[PDB]
Amino acid sequence: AVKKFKPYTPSRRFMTVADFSEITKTEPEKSLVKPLKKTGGRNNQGRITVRFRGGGHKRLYRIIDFKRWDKVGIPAKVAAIEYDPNRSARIALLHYVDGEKRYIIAPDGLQVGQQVVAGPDAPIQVGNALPLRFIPVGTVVHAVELEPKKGAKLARAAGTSAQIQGREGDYVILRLPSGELRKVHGECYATVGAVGNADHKNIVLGKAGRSRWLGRRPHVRGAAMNPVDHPHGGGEGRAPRGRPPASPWGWQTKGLKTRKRRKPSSRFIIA
RNA sequence: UAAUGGCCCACCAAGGCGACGACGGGUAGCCGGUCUGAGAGGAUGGCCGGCCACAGGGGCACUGAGACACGGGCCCCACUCCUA
RNA sequence: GCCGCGGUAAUACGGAGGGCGCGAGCGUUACCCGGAUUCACUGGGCGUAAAGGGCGUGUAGGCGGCCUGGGGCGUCCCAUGUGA
RNA sequence: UGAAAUGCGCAGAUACCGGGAGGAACGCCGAUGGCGAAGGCAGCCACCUGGUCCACCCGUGACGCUGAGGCGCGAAAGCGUGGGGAGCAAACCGGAUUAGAUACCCGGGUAGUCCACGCCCUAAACGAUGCGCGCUAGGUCUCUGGGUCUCCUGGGGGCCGAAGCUAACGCGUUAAGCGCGCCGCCUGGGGAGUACGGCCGCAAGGCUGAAACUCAAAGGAAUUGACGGGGGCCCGCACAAGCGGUGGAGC
RNA sequence: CCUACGGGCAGGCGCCGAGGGUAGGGCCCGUGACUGGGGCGAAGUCGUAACAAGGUAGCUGUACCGGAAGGUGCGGCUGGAUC
RNA sequence: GGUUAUUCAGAUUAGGUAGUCGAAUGACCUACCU
RNA sequence: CAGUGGAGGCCCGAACCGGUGGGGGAUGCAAACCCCUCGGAUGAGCUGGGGCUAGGAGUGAAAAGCUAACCGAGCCCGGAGA
RNA sequence: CGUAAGCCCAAGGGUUCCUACGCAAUGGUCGUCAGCGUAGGGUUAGGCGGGACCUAAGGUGAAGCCGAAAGGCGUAGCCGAAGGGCAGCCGGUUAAUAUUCCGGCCCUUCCCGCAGGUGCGAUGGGGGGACGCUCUAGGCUAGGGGGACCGGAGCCAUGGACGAGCCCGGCCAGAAGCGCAGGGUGGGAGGUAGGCAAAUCCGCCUCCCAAAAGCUCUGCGUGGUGGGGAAGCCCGUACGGGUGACAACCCCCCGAAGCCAGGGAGCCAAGAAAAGCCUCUAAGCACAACCUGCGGGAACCCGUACCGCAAACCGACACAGGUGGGCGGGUGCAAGAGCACUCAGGCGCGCGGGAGAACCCUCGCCAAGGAACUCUGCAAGUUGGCCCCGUAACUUCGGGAGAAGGGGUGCUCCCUGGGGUGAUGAGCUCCGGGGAGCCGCAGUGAACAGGCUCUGGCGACUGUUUACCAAAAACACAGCUCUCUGCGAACUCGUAAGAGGAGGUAUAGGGAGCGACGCUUGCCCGGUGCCGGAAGGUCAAGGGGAGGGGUGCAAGCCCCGAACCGAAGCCCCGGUGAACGGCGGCCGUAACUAUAACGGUCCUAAGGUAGCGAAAUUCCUUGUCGGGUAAGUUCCGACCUGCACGAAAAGCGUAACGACCGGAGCGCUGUCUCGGCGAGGGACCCGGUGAAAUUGAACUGGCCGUGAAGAUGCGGCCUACCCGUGGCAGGACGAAAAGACCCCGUGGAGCUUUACUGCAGCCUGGUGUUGGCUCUUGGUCGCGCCGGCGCGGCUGGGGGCCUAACCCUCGGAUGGGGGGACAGCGCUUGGC
RNA sequence: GGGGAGGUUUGGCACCUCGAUGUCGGCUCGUCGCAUCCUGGGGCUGAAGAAGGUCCCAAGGGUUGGGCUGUUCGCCCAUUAA
Ligand SMILES: [Mg+2]
Ligand SMILES: [Mg+2]
Ligand SMILES: [Mg+2]
Ligand SMILES: [Mg+2]
Ligand SMILES: [Mg+2]
Ligand SMILES: [Mg+2]
Ligand SMILES: [Mg+2]
Ligand SMILES: [Mg+2]
Ligand SMILES: [Mg+2]
Ligand SMILES: [Mg+2]
Ligand SMILES: [Mg+2]
Ligand SMILES: [Mg+2]
Ligand SMILES: [Mg+2]
Ligand SMILES: [Mg+2]
Ligand SMILES: [Mg+2]
Ligand SMILES: [Mg+2]
Ligand SMILES: [Mg+2]
Ligand SMILES: [Mg+2]
Ligand SMILES: [Mg+2]
Ligand SMILES: [Mg+2]
Ligand SMILES: [Mg+2]
Ligand SMILES: [Mg+2]
Ligand SMILES: [Mg+2]
Ligand SMILES: [Mg+2]
Ligand SMILES: [Mg+2]
Ligand SMILES: [Mg+2]
Ligand SMILES: [Mg+2]
Ligand SMILES: [Mg+2]
Ligand SMILES: [Mg+2]
Ligand SMILES: [Mg+2]
Ligand SMILES: [Mg+2]
Ligand SMILES: [Mg+2]
Ligand SMILES: [Mg+2]
Ligand SMILES: [Mg+2]
Ligand SMILES: [Mg+2]
Ligand SMILES: [Mg+2]
Ligand SMILES: [Mg+2]
Ligand SMILES: [Mg+2]
Ligand SMILES: [Mg+2]
Ligand SMILES: [Mg+2]
Ligand SMILES: [Mg+2]
Ligand SMILES: [Mg+2]
Ligand SMILES: [Mg+2]
Ligand SMILES: [Mg+2]
Ligand SMILES: [Mg+2]
Ligand SMILES: [Mg+2]
Ligand SMILES: [Mg+2]
Ligand SMILES: [Mg+2]
Ligand SMILES: [Mg+2]
Ligand SMILES: [Mg+2]
Ligand SMILES: [Mg+2]
Ligand SMILES: [Mg+2]
Ligand SMILES: [Mg+2]
Ligand SMILES: [Mg+2]
Ligand SMILES: [Mg+2]
Ligand SMILES: [Mg+2]
Ligand SMILES: [Mg+2]
Ligand SMILES: [Mg+2]
Ligand SMILES: [Mg+2]
Ligand SMILES: [Mg+2]
Ligand SMILES: [Mg+2]
Ligand SMILES: [Mg+2]
Ligand SMILES: [Mg+2]
Ligand SMILES: [Mg+2]
Ligand SMILES: [Mg+2]
Ligand SMILES: [Mg+2]
Ligand SMILES: [Mg+2]
Ligand SMILES: [Mg+2]
Ligand SMILES: [Mg+2]
Ligand SMILES: [Mg+2]
Ligand SMILES: [Mg+2]
Ligand SMILES: [Mg+2]
Ligand SMILES: [Mg+2]
Ligand SMILES: [Mg+2]
Ligand SMILES: [Mg+2]
Ligand SMILES: [Mg+2]
Ligand SMILES: [Mg+2]
Ligand SMILES: [Mg+2]
Ligand SMILES: [Mg+2]
Ligand SMILES: [Mg+2]
Ligand SMILES: [Mg+2]
Ligand SMILES: [Mg+2]
Ligand SMILES: [Mg+2]
Ligand SMILES: [Mg+2]
Ligand SMILES: [Mg+2]
Ligand SMILES: [Mg+2]
Ligand SMILES: [Mg+2]
Ligand SMILES: [Mg+2]
Ligand SMILES: [Mg+2]
Ligand SMILES: [Mg+2]
Ligand SMILES: [Mg+2]
Ligand SMILES: [Mg+2]
Ligand SMILES: [Mg+2]
Ligand SMILES: [Mg+2]
Ligand SMILES: [Mg+2]
Ligand SMILES: [Mg+2]
Ligand SMILES: [Mg+2]
Ligand SMILES: [Mg+2]
Ligand SMILES: [Mg+2]
Ligand SMILES: [Mg+2]
Ligand SMILES: [Mg+2]
Ligand SMILES: [Mg+2]
Ligand SMILES: [Mg+2]
Ligand SMILES: [Mg+2]
Ligand SMILES: [Mg+2]
Ligand SMILES: [Mg+2]
Ligand SMILES: [Mg+2]
Ligand SMILES: [Mg+2]
Ligand SMILES: [Mg+2]
Ligand SMILES: [Mg+2]
Ligand SMILES: [Mg+2]
Ligand SMILES: [Mg+2]
Ligand SMILES: [Mg+2]
Ligand SMILES: [Mg+2]
Ligand SMILES: [Mg+2]
Ligand SMILES: [Mg+2]
Ligand SMILES: [Mg+2]
Ligand SMILES: [Mg+2]
Ligand SMILES: [Mg+2]
Ligand SMILES: [Mg+2]
Ligand SMILES: [Mg+2]
Ligand SMILES: [Mg+2]
Ligand SMILES: [Mg+2]
Ligand SMILES: [Mg+2]
Ligand SMILES: [Mg+2]
Ligand SMILES: [Mg+2]
Ligand SMILES: [Mg+2]
Ligand SMILES: [Mg+2]
Ligand SMILES: [Mg+2]
Ligand SMILES: [Mg+2]
Ligand SMILES: [Mg+2]
Ligand SMILES: [Mg+2]
Ligand SMILES: [Mg+2]
Ligand SMILES: [Mg+2]
Ligand SMILES: [Mg+2]
Ligand SMILES: [Mg+2]
Ligand SMILES: [Mg+2]
Ligand SMILES: [Mg+2]
Ligand SMILES: [Mg+2]
Ligand SMILES: [Mg+2]
Ligand SMILES: [Mg+2]
Ligand SMILES: [Mg+2]
Ligand SMILES: [Mg+2]
Ligand SMILES: [Mg+2]
Ligand SMILES: [Mg+2]
Ligand SMILES: [Mg+2]
After folding, report:
1. Nearest nucleotide (C1') to alpha carbon of A175
2. What positions of strand G are covered by protein, i.e. any atom < 7 Å from a CB?
3. Which residues of A24-55 are buried (b: 16+ CB within 10 A; e: fewer)?
């Protein structure tokens, strides 16, 4: 399920790593209209905008098909399950009958071989994607859109997925990977079933360096800093939050909700 | 060596033993016999006869048909005495 | 020795008379066998008294139907040596 | 609820109709019922699969029975990772009862209960009855199978009882009878399923398992009784219905 | 040093060698502040858990909890009383 | 009239505990056990 | 079980990175050096070159450390003859 | 000196290069010398580097978006290189340059003409370029070793040797072709809806063949031939030129980290772009134009000296510091870029000479003792590599381990096993095993080179840090919990546009705390925070207008103003602890004593659970007891009356780890008893050069007084010839720094909060942007009709639907889709 | 109950020193005082002797090594003429 390690070295005694059995003996990404330069670290003034990112292995961006209604009715064969270094999910290089090739988030169950296709006609079989007004309520589906003709947003994380609770007018109900309850549009496309590689959560970085390869840098407790730096700044011998625990910017992080009441996305939720 | 034997040595082979109790630990001289018990059994080995082992502890060989020898020899340790 | 005895009327303590047993002995203690069929081969048990493994499956081991025949290992019998 | 109180309720509860979500368990059939080695197993559907009984007497020809150790299974609780989470519910909080009430009753409530995988391996894991085989009256109802079929025959499940066993209680062709094979276990109560050592286990723990000391017993079954905040039937100025009186005052 | 001149004894060296020394393990006995339970013994304190429906049926594996017996949860058991 | 605290005097008990129960005074408005 | 295999913020140790202890130096060789010693040394490694982020701002495995040899708020010129 | 202190690149430097003349200053002395002064020379390129090539981060930036101005963001494009692409190797010559001049061999583009060939043609399509880490094969080269073989001028010393003697040297480049070794690459045919319908290309489907060759490319070897070529000897300041051969130019071995290179295998952290190059076609052309050969022609710009681990760069200095890449020989040691010695090459560090005092530094040794030293074994010492034997608690089963403790190690002769090249053999080489023996005090004989154990604390671990007094027990960390966030995400930067988050989507991202792992994490929501709560209470603008006012002759104009409607917030109600936080006092009680399982009682929001406990917490205190020592305020084990532990500012524990901090023991020692001798670099003396802080001026003694209370300087007494040199640190309240402590100033600044007052931000009502239709409750005026029905403007509120503003988005759309009069933004209201 | 001496303690005062008079303990080197710990001389003694006690005189010299703590001090070990 996951590769363990004999403790021939500390850290290595706890560190597990995925088994890329599901990866169809295919190191190389499809160099074709498929990879792409990628880089970053912080924002477009020179300034850091997101703490503690940076460093960590070089990456190639694999272009992914998230609209998947360009090729309506056009089938394609699942040529490969590939490793994507920049999502939790695994990917499927699938060849279209067209001779067109793209990538898709490999869902659980997908076998290299499987035919697959998008469109309203399509079979409610694992892999195929089609509008929502069209999937039988109760179906667990993934890689969903949100507003129609707009690309997939919901449920793309590894082994995640949402179910259809019901329909209701031009909209359908969904239960997001978060448990949220939402009316999405009927005409929203969604590939069927749930996401590949659900085994993900159980890896265990195990050592410090491994987090670093991930490009995540060390992150330092508020407690550790000084008043200039951060509201937990009293430092004065390991010390108690002196107040309701806050962000480096001093907004409460202890439980305070942040979501803009008067958001219009509002009257389409329930969870 | 009186003589067989890994009894001892060199060389080679990878074996030998074990729940049918090896290996270890504890305990003990064994026997004819003796005590007990209806008997099967149990307990036992004083005296007597046989066998074994030992001679303050340990090691050794010499002489010899025979001993590694209680009242023989060499050595070490412990112990007693003599001393110039 | 055990069951127990002695808290006013003691055949259970101590003394007495008397009696019983055995006598150059009589008691105590120690240890062995017996009683103990209480390790049970002789000769024991397990529903509730102590005691059936929580249940399978199987290794070794133990045990094994009817008839003919060969050997004769156990088994049996005879003689003979031995059992000082 | 014994009666209550905490609790919920005008911020609109309880009762009622409609709509939706989610988890768990499977009413009636149901049983003195069946199946499985045991633990154990219950809506319906299919799929995959183990055992078992009967008929025909066709095949192999003693290939068997047991079974230390080993290996597997092993209720509930409990553990690890991850889900799930309606009702219930140790812990916990509150109400009440009480001398007190860390309980019984009530209101609330978390692990847990459910699933996947992994571990734990215990039990009144009980028929307190090891498995196999042959022997030794019958009566009764019941499940299941075969046969011209007011009944014979085989396999289970019960109650009553031949002989016989048995300390009694009870057993009795479902033996605790009569016999053989093999395994497991017992050897006075307490100390103690403890300690040490070993081996398992994430832990909680489990397996193996003493002794010092100490007691005159510990016990099984049955018999008389007496007692029960056990039951049934019945009696008495016992209570009730009823009239006086103490308790108060003085003596 | 002896010789019948071939050799012998003395002596030297080496092997092994009692034991002694050093170091590290194993088994066992004694002992140790203190601590754990256990057994017996005045007529001590606190409750009343079990025996009768023992006054909440009992026991039991486990789990939590509690001055203490013990209580509760989950399952199991009659070795449970009463129509 | 009520609440509470305490106390001994009784009361219920075979008896004790406790309690209930009663009274006084100050303040105030059925349970266990021998 | 043996073989093969060749993992690892694994071990010893130079380069390289670093600064643990002591001595020396203290108008120094040196405005942080020297010697002996010591830490890391396939990694959260070291490093050349090209770039971006700055003053209540940046950067910070967090010392209020660093930001051109003194940073609890850089340097310069100015308000200023506060 | 020789993994440099030698040699070649790059950066920085900028004439420091070479000559000639010269020494005032520069040079830490000297100077005839110089890196110094004067002057003259000196740097040569199609092929090396860079530009007339590509793209990276980034920058710039037509469009476009945003901002008071300045300016910000930004597409295409353009700029940007130690990365991609691209054609030169050996040797000679100068005082000074040289893949640059010359010699030799060998190449590249451009244009022209031509031959042959082909649908030609790009900025567009496609291929390719095009990629990580670790380990690694085959073959080869650089490089290196041996040679009795090839060449060579020479040498016989000092006892021996005329020899398989000694010493020197036995290479370098090279087109075609050939060979060896490797990389790259499927071929053919049909169909095609895709690569923004341009395709014979690429992709995808179908079948047939060859499964490898062939073709293509690269490395090496060879290869016509060109080159070079030592020791030693004569001339020689200089520095070379001759000799010096007509040189020889050959075998064998070791051998890369380099080459073949886009090789192979494994792994997870999943590993640039763009042009060149190839191919496809479009427009356009097919007398063009592409392609291949040959001939003739053309080929610019900039760098090129010298220094370059330093006396030429950065450090004010000819500064013991700092500075990226390549080469970096031999021998020995297990290996190596380590160590010792040494080639080549380069240096003796730009003050010397003496002396042989103290004292200081670096170093050596020491009788007996062996931690008694001391805050501390600080420091030194011991140990030290490899080989074999052996190795404990505990453990997370890997560890602990180099545990511990041991033995071996040199040289000679003999027997012998295996691997490599060759061929299987010899020779060479790599790694061994067995016996016999020799010498010394000692055999990793020198240099490199661990002392060890036991037991506490904290922290899991490797890591990080206060550049320049702190390296830690602090930070970090894998891991745990809480919390926010549904995507135009939350959050952060920005006035905005926008960006980061993320080309991510709840297995994700932001915040917070805790900090491997094991076992666990108790009670208290009264206060605070947060979350929930369509009721109520208060509450601003605004709406409303009874009622009152000013003025006017009036119509009016103007102002004040009650009820009543009006958000968020606060109040109120409930939840909430891995949210801020909190978690008691007193009296009585048991067989003697003591104690208190029991009770009582006051207070509370609730009174601290496990576990730990004189502790990184314990005041009293060196608590008390045990251990250890002759002796122990430390340490370890216990008890617990915890001044003042305690459960994620986590509680207890835990193998391993540690330049952490504590205690103990063994080894060893000059740490000490207790010092002594010796070495060198200073100190001292002579010659050259020649500072500094400091300094009221000085002709500057002791004592006892005294004085502003600590006198060379007043008094009194005592002592004392003048001047120096080497020494010591008691005084000159010695130097240094306008005391850091302390106070003061209505001085400053950083930090905090439930100080005050703002501001950003965020919440919020009205309103502008702002529209349509419809249902129903309230108002409003006219009418029909006995306070109510029907109607329209006005409506105010609430529900629903619409779409066209506004927002998002869609193969660019005068459009489709989604949201939608909301949101966003403007003004304004009150809040936090 | 009373009177003093000293100037080693704890203090009070705030006089020099805040354009600086470095703090506890140790080491090293001491030197002074005597109010004497030893040794020398003596008086009394409830001094037999021996050993002591108390006071007087006397600085000449001497006045150990370790354990524990930063300690001074103190406790402790082994001594000493002390
Ligand atoms: Mg952190
Ligand atoms: Mg702050
Ligand atoms: Mg704080
Ligand atoms: Mg801090
Ligand atoms: Mg603190
Ligand atoms: Mg033998
Ligand atoms: Mg052999
Ligand atoms: Mg014996
Ligand atoms: Mg004996
Ligand atoms: Mg017998
Ligand atoms: Mg015997
Ligand atoms: Mg015997
Ligand atoms: Mg005898
Ligand atoms: Mg005898
Ligand atoms: Mg003897
Ligand atoms: Mg004797
Ligand atoms: Mg002897
Ligand atoms: Mg004899
Ligand atoms: Mg003898
Ligand atoms: Mg004798
Ligand atoms: Mg004599
Ligand atoms: Mg004599
Ligand atoms: Mg009598
Ligand atoms: Mg009697
Ligand atoms: Mg009598
Ligand atoms: Mg008697
Ligand atoms: Mg017997
Ligand atoms: Mg017997
Ligand atoms: Mg028997
Ligand atoms: Mg029996
Ligand atoms: Mg059974
Ligand atoms: Mg026969
Ligand atoms: Mg369970
Ligand atoms: Mg639990
Ligand atoms: Mg049962
Ligand atoms: Mg019966
Ligand atoms: Mg009968
Ligand atoms: Mg029987
Ligand atoms: Mg047991
Ligand atoms: Mg048990
Ligand atoms: Mg044991
Ligand atoms: Mg656990
Ligand atoms: Mg009365
Ligand atoms: Mg003779
Ligand atoms: Mg021998
Ligand atoms: Mg009871
Ligand atoms: Mg009760
Ligand atoms: Mg109950
Ligand atoms: Mg009960
Ligand atoms: Mg009962
Ligand atoms: Mg059961
Ligand atoms: Mg019963
Ligand atoms: Mg019962
Ligand atoms: Mg009274
Ligand atoms: Mg390795
Ligand atoms: Mg490492
Ligand atoms: Mg480096
Ligand atoms: Mg100095
Ligand atoms: Mg500033
Ligand atoms: Mg300046
Ligand atoms: Mg001014
Ligand atoms: Mg080096
Ligand atoms: Mg010049
Ligand atoms: Mg030159
Ligand atoms: Mg000059
Ligand atoms: Mg000069
Ligand atoms: Mg100089
Ligand atoms: Mg001259
Ligand atoms: Mg001259
Ligand atoms: Mg000259
Ligand atoms: Mg030009
Ligand atoms: Mg734009
Ligand atoms: Mg460009
Ligand atoms: Mg070039
Ligand atoms: Mg022509
Ligand atoms: Mg073409
Ligand atoms: Mg092109
Ligand atoms: Mg590259
Ligand atoms: Mg020749
Ligand atoms: Mg000669
Ligand atoms: Mg030579
Ligand atoms: Mg020579
Ligand atoms: Mg070949
Ligand atoms: Mg096409
Ligand atoms: Mg076409
Ligand atoms: Mg073609
Ligand atoms: Mg063509
Ligand atoms: Mg070759
Ligand atoms: Mg060649
Ligand atoms: Mg040639
Ligand atoms: Mg040049
Ligand atoms: Mg340098
Ligand atoms: Mg300079
Ligand atoms: Mg110099
Ligand atoms: Mg080299
Ligand atoms: Mg010099
Ligand atoms: Mg010495
Ligand atoms: Mg010595
Ligand atoms: Mg001493
Ligand atoms: Mg100390
Ligand atoms: Mg040291
Ligand atoms: Mg060790
Ligand atoms: Mg040698
Ligand atoms: Mg070492
Ligand atoms: Mg570290
Ligand atoms: Mg520092
Ligand atoms: Mg963005
Ligand atoms: Mg954005
Ligand atoms: Mg992005
Ligand atoms: Mg992501
Ligand atoms: Mg746990
Ligand atoms: Mg807590
Ligand atoms: Mg209401
Ligand atoms: Mg009016
Ligand atoms: Mg008027
Ligand atoms: Mg109104
Ligand atoms: Mg409001
Ligand atoms: Mg809690
Ligand atoms: Mg509080
Ligand atoms: Mg009371
Ligand atoms: Mg203390
Ligand atoms: Mg203390
Ligand atoms: Mg003490
Ligand atoms: Mg206390
Ligand atoms: Mg907390
Ligand atoms: Mg806390
Ligand atoms: Mg470290
Ligand atoms: Mg001042
Ligand atoms: Mg003032
Ligand atoms: Mg002020
Ligand atoms: Mg209306
Ligand atoms: Mg409205
Ligand atoms: Mg709508
Ligand atoms: Mg629309
Ligand atoms: Mg719409
Ligand atoms: Mg238009
Ligand atoms: Mg809509
Ligand atoms: Mg001054
Ligand atoms: Mg001064
Ligand atoms: Mg001071
Ligand atoms: Mg006297
Ligand atoms: Mg005297
Ligand atoms: Mg006097
Ligand atoms: Mg005197
Ligand atoms: Mg004196
Ligand atoms: Mg003290």
Report:
1. H486
2. 7-10, 43-45, 52-54, 58-64, 72-73
3. beeeebbeeebeeeeeeeeeeeeeeeeeeeee
